[PDB]
Amino acid sequence: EQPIFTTRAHVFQINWVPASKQAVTVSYFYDVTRNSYRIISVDGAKVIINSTITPNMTFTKTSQKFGQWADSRANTVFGLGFSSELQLTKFAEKFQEVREAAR
């Protein structure tokens, strides 16, 4: 009933530009038809993150409250700003697992 993982943060895209007027919900979903996981975040009428996680993708913590990952398909880099190190830590953790399940 609940997503694999869900959190809240500020979204930025590639210098950085804000993608969300405020902190929004960001979640991991299992894309049934595609047989892969996707990170999805919406804000109003816009879906600001619709990223499929593949094995060769990597999430980097460029700080203990900020992290990022490159998305070739969408051709853009996404950055998330967290209000706490713990959230960032749990997000980066799920990212790794999800990537390992994509192997």
PDB file of C-alpha atoms in Angstrom:
ATOM      1  CA  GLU A   1       0.000   0.000   0.000  1.00  0.00           C
ATOM      2  CA  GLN A   2       2.963   2.306   0.621  1.00  0.00           C
ATOM      3  CA  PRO A   3       5.799   2.996  -1.841  1.00  0.00           C
ATOM      4  CA  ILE A   4       9.046   1.069  -1.511  1.00  0.00           C
ATOM      5  CA  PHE A   5      10.393   4.285   0.000  1.00  0.00           C
ATOM      6  CA  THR A   6       9.118   7.846   0.344  1.00  0.00           C
ATOM      7  CA  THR A   7      10.609  11.104   1.558  1.00  0.00           C
ATOM      8  CA  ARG A   8      10.506  14.865   1.213  1.00  0.00           C
ATOM      9  CA  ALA A   9      13.115  17.236  -0.158  1.00  0.00           C
ATOM     10  CA  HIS A  10      13.929  20.146  -2.420  1.00  0.00           C
ATOM     11  CA  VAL A  11      14.517  19.275  -6.062  1.00  0.00           C
ATOM     12  CA  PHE A  12      17.122  20.841  -8.329  1.00  0.00           C
ATOM     13  CA  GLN A  13      18.172  20.139 -11.930  1.00  0.00           C
ATOM     14  CA  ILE A  14      21.122  20.847 -14.162  1.00  0.00           C
ATOM     15  CA  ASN A  15      24.544  25.258 -12.772  1.00  0.00           C
ATOM     16  CA  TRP A  16      21.722  24.057 -10.519  1.00  0.00           C
ATOM     17  CA  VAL A  17      18.236  25.423 -10.917  1.00  0.00           C
ATOM     18  CA  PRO A  18      15.373  24.823  -8.504  1.00  0.00           C
ATOM     19  CA  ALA A  19      12.806  22.366  -9.848  1.00  0.00           C
ATOM     20  CA  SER A  20      10.338  22.642  -6.967  1.00  0.00           C
ATOM     21  CA  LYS A  21       8.989  25.874  -5.472  1.00  0.00           C
ATOM     22  CA  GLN A  22       9.165  23.993  -2.160  1.00  0.00           C
ATOM     23  CA  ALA A  23       9.993  20.676  -0.481  1.00  0.00           C
ATOM     24  CA  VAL A  24       8.030  17.891  -2.170  1.00  0.00           C
ATOM     25  CA  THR A  25       7.466  14.176  -1.859  1.00  0.00           C
ATOM     26  CA  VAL A  26       9.962  11.913  -3.662  1.00  0.00           C
ATOM     27  CA  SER A  27       9.310   8.126  -3.910  1.00  0.00           C
ATOM     28  CA  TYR A  28      10.585   4.854  -5.346  1.00  0.00           C
ATOM     29  CA  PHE A  29       8.141   2.758  -7.382  1.00  0.00           C
ATOM     30  CA  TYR A  30       8.441  -0.588  -9.074  1.00  0.00           C
ATOM     31  CA  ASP A  31       7.654  -0.153 -12.779  1.00  0.00           C
ATOM     32  CA  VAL A  32       5.850  -3.432 -13.500  1.00  0.00           C
ATOM     33  CA  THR A  33       5.696  -3.319 -17.288  1.00  0.00           C
ATOM     34  CA  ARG A  34       9.299  -2.106 -17.613  1.00  0.00           C
ATOM     35  CA  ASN A  35      10.779  -4.488 -15.012  1.00  0.00           C
ATOM     36  CA  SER A  36      12.734  -1.752 -13.263  1.00  0.00           C
ATOM     37  CA  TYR A  37      12.492   0.816 -10.499  1.00  0.00           C
ATOM     38  CA  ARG A  38      11.666   4.463 -11.011  1.00  0.00           C
ATOM     39  CA  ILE A  39      12.006   7.491  -8.780  1.00  0.00           C
ATOM     40  CA  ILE A  40       8.921   9.709  -9.152  1.00  0.00           C
ATOM     41  CA  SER A  41       8.228  13.177  -7.730  1.00  0.00           C
ATOM     42  CA  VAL A  42       5.340  15.471  -8.688  1.00  0.00           C
ATOM     43  CA  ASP A  43       4.551  19.084  -7.828  1.00  0.00           C
ATOM     44  CA  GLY A  44       1.186  20.393  -8.931  1.00  0.00           C
ATOM     45  CA  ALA A  45       0.530  19.577 -12.587  1.00  0.00           C
ATOM     46  CA  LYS A  46       4.167  18.763 -13.194  1.00  0.00           C
ATOM     47  CA  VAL A  47       6.172  15.565 -12.732  1.00  0.00           C
ATOM     48  CA  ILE A  48       9.637  16.890 -11.957  1.00  0.00           C
ATOM     49  CA  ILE A  49      11.374  13.551 -11.506  1.00  0.00           C
ATOM     50  CA  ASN A  50      10.591  10.423 -13.536  1.00  0.00           C
ATOM     51  CA  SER A  51      13.893   8.588 -13.258  1.00  0.00           C
ATOM     52  CA  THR A  52      14.509   4.890 -13.955  1.00  0.00           C
ATOM     53  CA  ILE A  53      17.320   3.511 -11.835  1.00  0.00           C
ATOM     54  CA  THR A  54      19.852   1.440 -13.742  1.00  0.00           C
ATOM     55  CA  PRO A  55      22.970  -0.452 -12.558  1.00  0.00           C
ATOM     56  CA  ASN A  56      25.522   1.919 -14.109  1.00  0.00           C
ATOM     57  CA  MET A  57      23.848   4.881 -12.416  1.00  0.00           C
ATOM     58  CA  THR A  58      25.259   6.360  -9.223  1.00  0.00           C
ATOM     59  CA  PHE A  59      24.008   8.512  -6.363  1.00  0.00           C
ATOM     60  CA  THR A  60      26.635  10.817  -4.881  1.00  0.00           C
ATOM     61  CA  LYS A  61      26.362  12.626  -1.550  1.00  0.00           C
ATOM     62  CA  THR A  62      28.096  15.934  -2.253  1.00  0.00           C
ATOM     63  CA  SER A  63      27.238  16.836   1.334  1.00  0.00           C
ATOM     64  CA  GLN A  64      25.485  15.187   4.267  1.00  0.00           C
ATOM     65  CA  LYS A  65      22.178  16.849   3.364  1.00  0.00           C
ATOM     66  CA  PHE A  66      22.488  17.003  -0.411  1.00  0.00           C
ATOM     67  CA  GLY A  67      22.906  14.267  -3.025  1.00  0.00           C
ATOM     68  CA  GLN A  68      22.742  13.790  -6.797  1.00  0.00           C
ATOM     69  CA  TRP A  69      22.601  11.362  -9.706  1.00  0.00           C
ATOM     70  CA  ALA A  70      22.898  11.633 -13.477  1.00  0.00           C
ATOM     71  CA  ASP A  71      20.126  10.489 -15.801  1.00  0.00           C
ATOM     72  CA  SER A  72      21.189   9.922 -19.409  1.00  0.00           C
ATOM     73  CA  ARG A  73      17.712   9.053 -20.682  1.00  0.00           C
ATOM     74  CA  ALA A  74      16.169  12.276 -19.393  1.00  0.00           C
ATOM     75  CA  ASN A  75      19.547  13.831 -20.098  1.00  0.00           C
ATOM     76  CA  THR A  76      19.828  15.823 -16.889  1.00  0.00           C
ATOM     77  CA  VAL A  77      21.233  15.681 -13.368  1.00  0.00           C
ATOM     78  CA  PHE A  78      18.854  15.682 -10.388  1.00  0.00           C
ATOM     79  CA  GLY A  79      19.785  17.009  -6.968  1.00  0.00           C
ATOM     80  CA  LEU A  80      17.853  16.558  -3.736  1.00  0.00           C
ATOM     81  CA  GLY A  81      18.192  18.764  -0.674  1.00  0.00           C
ATOM     82  CA  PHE A  82      17.230  17.167   2.645  1.00  0.00           C
ATOM     83  CA  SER A  83      16.380  18.760   5.998  1.00  0.00           C
ATOM     84  CA  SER A  84      18.354  16.033   7.784  1.00  0.00           C
ATOM     85  CA  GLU A  85      21.352  13.765   7.245  1.00  0.00           C
ATOM     86  CA  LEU A  86      19.235  10.773   8.222  1.00  0.00           C
ATOM     87  CA  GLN A  87      16.816  11.300   5.323  1.00  0.00           C
ATOM     88  CA  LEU A  88      19.692  11.652   2.842  1.00  0.00           C
ATOM     89  CA  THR A  89      21.252   8.518   4.364  1.00  0.00           C
ATOM     90  CA  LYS A  90      18.092   6.469   4.001  1.00  0.00           C
ATOM     91  CA  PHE A  91      17.536   7.729   0.436  1.00  0.00           C
ATOM     92  CA  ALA A  92      21.062   6.876  -0.702  1.00  0.00           C
ATOM     93  CA  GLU A  93      20.676   3.474   0.919  1.00  0.00           C
ATOM     94  CA  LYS A  94      17.499   2.651  -1.008  1.00  0.00           C
ATOM     95  CA  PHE A  95      19.156   3.923  -4.173  1.00  0.00           C
ATOM     96  CA  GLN A  96      21.941   1.328  -3.756  1.00  0.00           C
ATOM     97  CA  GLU A  97      19.589  -1.557  -3.000  1.00  0.00           C
ATOM     98  CA  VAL A  98      17.322  -0.633  -5.886  1.00  0.00           C
ATOM     99  CA  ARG A  99      20.352  -0.525  -8.184  1.00  0.00           C
ATOM    100  CA  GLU A 100      21.501  -3.933  -6.911  1.00  0.00           C
ATOM    101  CA  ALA A 101      18.041  -5.374  -7.649  1.00  0.00           C
ATOM    102  CA  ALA A 102      18.364  -4.073 -11.208  1.00  0.00           C
ATOM    103  CA  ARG A 103      21.497  -6.174 -11.808  1.00  0.00           C
TER     104      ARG A 103
END
